[PDB]
């Protein structure tokens, strides 16, 4: 899978952005959200989020879903490194387990 954020930005640029956040905001995590490639679902206009680390994955889903051009009944699923996260996990927990070398957490969403 290929996040467009990674095509649009050099690693060293992304790492500087992610590392600054981690060192200056202990209560926040830098998150990229993009549609999974094969996904068949409405579009999200913004991809770069600064996310309270103590939000649960379920709470993050609620806030993100509001921003996706969706049909009212559409559900979506999050994948982090190809795994659907638990909803009771927090974004800080996911970040510790799954952040990439540029220090971002990447979430792909899909209609699945």
């Amino acid at each position: 899978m290929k996040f467009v954020y990674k095509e649009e930005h050099p690693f060293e640029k992304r790492r500087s952005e992610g590392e600054k956040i981690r060192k200056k905001y202990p209560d926040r995590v830098p998150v990229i959200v993009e549609k999974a490639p094969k996904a068949r679902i409405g579009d999200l206009d913004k991809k770069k989020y600064l996310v309270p680390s103590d939000l649960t994955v379920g709470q993050f889903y609620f806030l993100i879903r509001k921003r996706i051009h969706l049909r009212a009944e559409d559900a979506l699923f999050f994948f982090v490194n190809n795994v659907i996260p638990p909803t009771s996990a927090t974004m800080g927990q996911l970040y510790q387990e799954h952040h990439e070398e540029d220090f971002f957490l990447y979430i792909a969403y899909s209609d699945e």
């Binding site: 930005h9 640029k13 952005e17 830098p30 913004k46 770069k48 989020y49 600064l50 996310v51 309270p52 939000l55 709470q59 609620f62 806030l63 509001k66």
Partner: peptide, 15 residues
């Protein structure tokens, strides 16, 4: 360069 979306205005609806 790319701006951050912060969700600050959103947290109110979680309370």
């Amino acid at each position: 360069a790319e701006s951050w979306e912060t969700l600050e205005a959103d947290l109110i609806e979680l309370s």
